[PDB]
């Protein structure tokens, strides 16, 4: 490595890593890859959405539209151009279509007219190289969603009929799209049906709609006990395995042996008796069948009348009629009280319909009520509900879960439902009602899949595609045929409108958090339970907001918001993947015969619930087996002890449970989870400061986050560095990585002082030097808050834990003045103000420096063209750009007539409406961008900005042509030395004139002339690129309708810390700065070094975040090692002393896995390493794999510091000594984005709301603090009647009272005269406009 040889973090983890941390943005990039990518058959994304609707026939069938292929054009602008211009970053969608015409005058007139032109179906916004979308110039992130998977889920309730406290089992079939279908039960044990949660029908209505009679329903849902009547005494063929524990209605009989007596219940020994005798027929008394229900339709075969139908309780006269009619063999259903219930019998008795047509009009009367139901209308509705692919789909994940839950075998199948599926769901629900089987776990991670950005945009594309497919089928039905192109009938409005509506304003298209790189990467790895198809925030219970045991390795349990969003927004764990179906999976190492191998299996949520999986904190040796016998494991939800050979899997790493941000906390295992949650939250709100500062106590996940966030500049191809700048890095590639048709020069253009979404600063500082060799995959430029490729959100602060005079009372923080002097937590806040020149109907506005009735002091900051200079330090109430507005003539006086006569300013009354900087805001001006529309000549200032951009682009294209002609002349040198041997005669002459040298005409001469004309056409495409760039920056902008030109002004403020600024560590220890104490007042030790920050010790033993204290002690040790290395470097000892001491500090831990050896390090690298270590040696500490207190004390003993962690501090002011030793060390503090510059607000009088005449709300529009209902109650409890009347009237919506109060206060007479608040008159007028006469009755 090369960026790692310059500063190596000491690792304290004792376990090896058999699987590295993957690419942290594989979920977003892979989902959009599967959406946008061209696949032949494994249907994904755009090709699947095209095949789902194409082809389409006519209203008759005389023409149809075939889809051939689609492609995507090149985007018109790169990502930085879209972010500058304020347009989305999209691509044109060009798709080849085929239009054929069926000659209906012919029997099969296939070929009449074949059209194949290129059609333009809207635009799709592309995803950049970091996983974000640029929509209208701003940067968004489409958060993944966690919804219920399609399929069937047999759930239940828990005591909803409290008249009995019974359970009421219910199924629910969830399609991907289409009408839901829910079977359920009642307290009277009847199967019901709701379609789309509508009114309850009996559940045999759907069966009779499926063309099933009562007989076939009974055969499907019951079994037959067969009865034969012989010489007027009844006999029953009895299978003995139908009688469990119940009493006998009669003394049972066999051929010659009595087994079970009357009044004697039948035992399992009696079951063994009746299977060991193997009897078949058993005679039965008359009253035993009085209670059975006939399952067969029976008619008197002599005459032809219905004697008894199916499902009717037979009687004595009915059995006499069945004996005398000739039907001497009856089939009744077998029922029971315990298991085989009479549910379907009772639903057939409740069931009022009788045939297919009556059930169909019952379904139509339920679905589209208040209409006359007809036969074909009810038939077409019932077909289109479930059994038609154009209005119902399971999309094969629902089919997988369906066959999985019905215990089937075949995975793939029909997307639509069918009769076997419906009767299988009813049979399984009846099995649940029996007792064989179990209900499903609703909050399982096998019932909840992940619907990512590519799937969601595919569905919105399909919605737009059917919305345009309907209209193009309508047009193809009635239009002409010979001249009908596909282009004028395909309309790009619905598809582009739907996909732009989704990408711009869905509930899952979120404005990306851009505080630090951890903010953006945690947003891009986020999982939302809300959105379209998911839950809602207000009506979600505690069961969805809990840590299910299947979250181990897939979803983080300690990273989530802490408000009303707590269980509903989750975070993906570090190693978590998805299936092809969308279920979360996490890797495990397969153990075989005790040997834990290095084979990695990604197990999904349901597969891991079978095996025994070892913990990652179980001990291994010699790459062998476990060191103990009673090993912990987890299986089937719970976690208990197991043997060392029974185990099936092991966790791949110790950080497998926690997310990205929760695995940056050192000593996380010593933290309470309520504080670790808040630390993982508050790391994402930390502003990037002026100079980045790596944590001395870290995790080693910092380099992974800093590289994978895309916020740095990583090297695409390794080599050596040719030229560094503040804004450019030029890398000469090695010839091995160089391709045989190029030069081998990469250019990196660093983005400098770009604004983030949270108005913070983004700039890339180059971390390499001149002539330094790099490799492929090292960091070239530190981003906003990274330091040498490590994540650096804050600074390392010398922290003392003691109470200091009540200045750290209740989570407060006392800060030295050296932290404010040295500018450690000083952040830059870039802020963009805009000024739009619009076309008023009274006259067009103009942006010119000529501003009326203002003083010439404010005109010094503007230029002669009306725009402020780059670099001018503006303040509040100043002017940035002078835009005046035509007020309007509206009068004809001789004064204005003489004015328009003498000057010609025909709108000589103008209203100055210039853009002014809002109050309380300051800072310089770092960037001015002026956009203009077509036709209007722009300005001198816009010409100057245009010339500067033109010169910059021309310099970039000139360097591009220089390196490309260098590579081409290297290629002609290579083919010249391949053809002949000419070395001195080619380089004794200049390289640009390498074309006039020649020889005899041969293959190499032909190659010389062909590369000559290739260099000529290279010059041709070079000047074509120049002309394209020139016309692109000279063309007028595609601005909104109604504007003429837009001026954007960028400010930049530096915000030092102050009392009231919020500050936090990493363990959920937030605090507000209360005082900024001088260095002569801070406490110190006997070397005289004062402490940078004094924290409160009483915040520790209630919140139980002991990682605070352990990070303090390890930071004290690390800074002690850095102090000793700095002492040796300042004394300039040797290289051998430095090598010995740094080696002793490196190989220090107990049995740690890091083996660093400076024997291979050359002396310049050891001096470079000691220079980077002179401010403190950084120390890694993985989560749940930490450094012990023994290793902390060992490092403290190396650093010649106290072993117990505590030194003796002296008072800063009195010079005396604190009576106890005080814990002093180096915590890592962050500066959160809740600054008192943004919270502080005050208002005496301002603007008012229009309807209610009450003061506004908000610091942005200078609002008033809402004196709400609870404060009205508090004043009522005090008794302050005059203060309450003052609040309700004269500080509020009472107009005469508030004007008189202002002028009475200025008159020195503090007295109010109150009246009626105007919101009461608003209320009176609204109750009157409801047709209700309300009036204040006078006395």
């Amino acid at each position: 490595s090369y960026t790692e040889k310059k500063r190596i973090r000491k690792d304290f983890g004792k376990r090896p890593q058999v699987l590295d941390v993957p690419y942290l943005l594989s979920i977003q990039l892979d989902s959009f890859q599967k959406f946008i990518e061209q696949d032949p058959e494994g249907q994904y994304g755009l090709e699947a959405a095209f095949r789902s609707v194409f082809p389409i026939q006519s209203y008759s069938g005389n023409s149809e539209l075939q889809y051939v292929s689609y492609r995507l054009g090149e985007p018109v602008f790169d990502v930085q151009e879209c972010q500058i211009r304020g347009v989305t970053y999209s691509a044109p969608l060009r798709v080849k279509l085929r239009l054929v015409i069926y000659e209906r005058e012919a029997p099969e007139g296939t070929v009449k007219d074949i059209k194949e032109q290129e059609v333009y179906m809207g635009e799709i916004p592309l995803m950049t190289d970091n996983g974000t979308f640029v929509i209208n110039g701003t940067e968004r992130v489409i958060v993944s969603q966690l919804h219920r998977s399609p399929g069937v889920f047999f759930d239940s309730d828990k005591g909803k009929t409290h008249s009995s406290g019974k359970v009421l089992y219910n199924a629910r079939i969830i399609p991907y799209r289409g009408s839901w279908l829910d079977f359920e039960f009642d307290p009277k044990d009847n199967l019901f049906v709701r379609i789309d949660r509508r009114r309850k029908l009996p559940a045999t209505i759907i069966l009779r709609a499926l063309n099933y009679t009562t007989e076939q329903i009974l055969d499907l849902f019951f079994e037959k006990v067969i009865f034969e009547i012989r010489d007027n005494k009844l006999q029953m063929e009895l299978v003995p395995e139908r009688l469990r524990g119940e009493t006998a209605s009669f003394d049972i009989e066999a051929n010659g042996k009595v087994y079970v007596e009357k009044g004697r219940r039948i035992t399992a020994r009696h079951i063994r008796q009746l299977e060991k005798d193997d009897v078949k027929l058993i005679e039965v008394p008359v009253e035993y069948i009085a209670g059975k229900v006939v399952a067969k339709d029976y008619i008197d075969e002599s005459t032809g009348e219905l004697i008894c139908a199916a499902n009717m309780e037979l009687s004595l006269d009915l059995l006499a009629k069945l004996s005398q009619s000739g039907h001497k063999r009856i089939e009744t259903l077998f029922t029971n009280d315990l298991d085989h219930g009479p549910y379907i019998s009772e639903t057939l008795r409740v069931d009022p319909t009788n045939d297919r047509l009556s059930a169909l009009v019952e379904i139509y009367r339920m679905m589209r009520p208040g209409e006359p139901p007809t036969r074909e209308a009810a038939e077409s509705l019932f077909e289109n509900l479930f059994f038609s692919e154009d209005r119902y789909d399971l999309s094969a994940v629902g089919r997988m879960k369906f066959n999985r839950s019905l215990l089937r075998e075949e995975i793939e199948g029909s997307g639509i439902l069918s009769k076997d599926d419906i009767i299988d769901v009813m049979k399984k629900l009846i099995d649940i009602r029996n007792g064989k089987g179990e209900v499903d776990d609703i909050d399982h991670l096998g019932n909840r899949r992940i619907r990512s950005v590519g799937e969601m945009a595919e569905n919105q594309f399909r919605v737009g595609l059917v919305r345009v497919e309907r209209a193009v089928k309508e047009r193809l039905s009635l239009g002409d045929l010979d001249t009908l192109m596909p282009q004028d009938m395909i309309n790009a409005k619905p598809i582009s409108a739907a996909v732009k509506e989704f990408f711009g304003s869905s509930q899952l298209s979120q404005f990306m958090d851009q505080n630090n790189p951890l903010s953006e990467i945690t947003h891009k790895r986020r999982i939302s339970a809300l959105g379209p198809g998911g839950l809602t925030r207000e009506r979600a219970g505690f069961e969805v907001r809990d840590v299910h045991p299947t979250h181990y390795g897939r979803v983080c349990p300690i990273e989530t918001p802490e408000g009303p969003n707590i269980g509903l927004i989750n975070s993906l764990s570090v190693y978590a993947q998805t299936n092809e179906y969308g279920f979360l999976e996490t890797p495990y190492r397969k153990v075989t015969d005790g040997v834990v191998t290095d084979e990695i299996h990604y197990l999904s949520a349901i597969e891991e619930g079978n095996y025994v999986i070892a913990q990652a904190n179980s001990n291994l040796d010699e790459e062998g087996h476990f060191v103990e016998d009673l090993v912990t494991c987890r299986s089937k939800g719970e976690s208990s002890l197991f043997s060392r050979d029974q185990v099936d899997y092991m966790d791949v790493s110790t950080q497998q449970v926690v997310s990205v941000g929760a695995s940056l906390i050192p000593f996380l295992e010593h933290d309470d989870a309520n504080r670790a949650l808040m630390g993982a939250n508050m790391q994402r709100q930390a502003v990037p400061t002026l100079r980045a500062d790596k944590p001395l106590v870290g995790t080693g996940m910092e380099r992974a986050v800093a590289v994978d966030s895309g916020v740095t500049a990583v090297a695409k191809r390794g080599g050596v560095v040719q030229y560094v700048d503040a804004s450019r890095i030029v890398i000469k590639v090695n010839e091995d990585e160089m391709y045989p048709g190029e030069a081998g020069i990469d250019i990196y253009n660093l983005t400098k002082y770009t604004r983030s979404n949270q108005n913070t600063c983004i700039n890339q500082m180059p971390c390499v030097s001149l002539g330094e060799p790099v490799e492929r995959g090292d960091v070239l430029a530190d981003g906003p808050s990274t330091d040498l490729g490590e994540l650096a959100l804050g600074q390392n602060m010398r922290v003392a834990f003691m109470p200091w005079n009540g200045y750290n009372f209740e989570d407060s923080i006392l800060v030295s003045e050296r932290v404010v002097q040295e500018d450690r937590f000083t952040t830059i806040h870039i802020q963009e103000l805009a000024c739009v020149s619009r076309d008023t109907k009274l006259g067009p506005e103009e942006i010119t420096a000529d501003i009326p009735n203002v003083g010439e002091a404010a005109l010094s900051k503007l230029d002669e063209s009306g725009i402020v200079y780059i670099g001018a330090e503006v303040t509040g109430g100043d002017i940035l750009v002078g835009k005046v507005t035509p007020k309007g003539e509206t009068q004809l006086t001789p004064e204005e007539k003489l004015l328009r006569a003498i000057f010609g300013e025909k709108a000589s009354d103008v209203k100055d409406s210039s853009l002014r900087v809002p109050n309380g805001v300051s800072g310089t001006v770092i960037d001015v961008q002026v956009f203009t529309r077509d036709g209007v000549e722009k300005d001198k200032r816009a010409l100057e900005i245009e010339e500067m951009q033109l010169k910059q682009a021309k310099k970039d294209l000139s360097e591009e042509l220089q390196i490309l002609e260098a590579g081409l002349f290297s290629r002609i040198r290579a083919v010249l030395v391949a053809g002949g041997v000419e070395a001195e005669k080619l380089d004794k002459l200049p390289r640009d004139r390498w074309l006039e040298l020649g020889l005899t005409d041969e293959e190499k001469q032909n190659q010389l002339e062909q590369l000559a004309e290739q260099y000529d056409e290279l010059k041709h495409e070079f000047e074509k690129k120049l002309e394209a760039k020139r016309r692109k920056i000279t063309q007028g902008d595609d601005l909104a309708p109604g504007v003429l030109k837009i001026v954007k002004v960028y400010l930049a403020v530096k915000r030092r810390i102050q009392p009231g600024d919020k500050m936090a560590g990493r363990h959920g220890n937030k605090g507000v700065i209360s005082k900024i104490n001088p260095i002569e007042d801070m406490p110190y030790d006997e070397n005289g070094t004062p402490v940078d920050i004094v924290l409160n010790p009483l915040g520790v033993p209630s919140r139980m975040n002991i990682g605070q204290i352990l990070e303090t002690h390890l930071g004290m040790a690390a800074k002690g090692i850095g102090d000793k290395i700095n002492a040796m470097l300042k004394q300039q000892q040797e290289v051998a002393k430095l090598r010995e001491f740094i080696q002793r500090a490196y190989d220090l831990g107990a049995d740690v896995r890091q083996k660093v050896d400076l024997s291979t390090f050359s002396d310049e690298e050891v001096m470079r390493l000691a220079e980077n270590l002179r401010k403190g040696m950084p120390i890694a500490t993985p989560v749940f794999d930490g450094a012990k207190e023994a290793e902390i004390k060992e490092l403290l003993k190396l650093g010649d510091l106290p072993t117990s962690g505590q030194i003796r501090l002296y008072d800063g002011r009195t010079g005396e000594q604190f009576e106890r030793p005080v814990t002093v060390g180096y915590m890592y503090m962050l500066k959160l984005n809740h600054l008192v510059d943004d919270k502080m607000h005050a208002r005496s009088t301002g603007s008012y709301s229009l309807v209610t005449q009450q003061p506004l709300g908000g610091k942005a529009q200078f609002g008033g603090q809402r004196f709400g209902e609870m404060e009205v109650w508090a004043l009522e409890a005090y008794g302050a009647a005059y203060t309450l009347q003052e609040m309700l009237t004269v500080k509020s919506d009472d107009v005469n009272g508030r004007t008189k109060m202002y002028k009475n206060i200025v008159d020195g007479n503090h007295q109010m005269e109150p009246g009626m608040p105007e919101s009461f008159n608003v209320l009176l007028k609204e109750i009157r406009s409801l047709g209700i006469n309300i009036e204040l009755e006078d006395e």
Binding site: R365, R368, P369, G370, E371, P372
Partner: peptide, 23 residues
């Protein structure tokens, strides 16, 4: 059926669907 609806266009469609179409 008269009664169980509240959609006005559904009631209007039900009303207009009774008079027969001319030849």
């Amino acid at each position: 059926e008269i009664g169980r609806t509240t959609d006005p266009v559904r009631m209007y469609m039900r009303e207009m669907g009774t008079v027969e179409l001319l030849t």
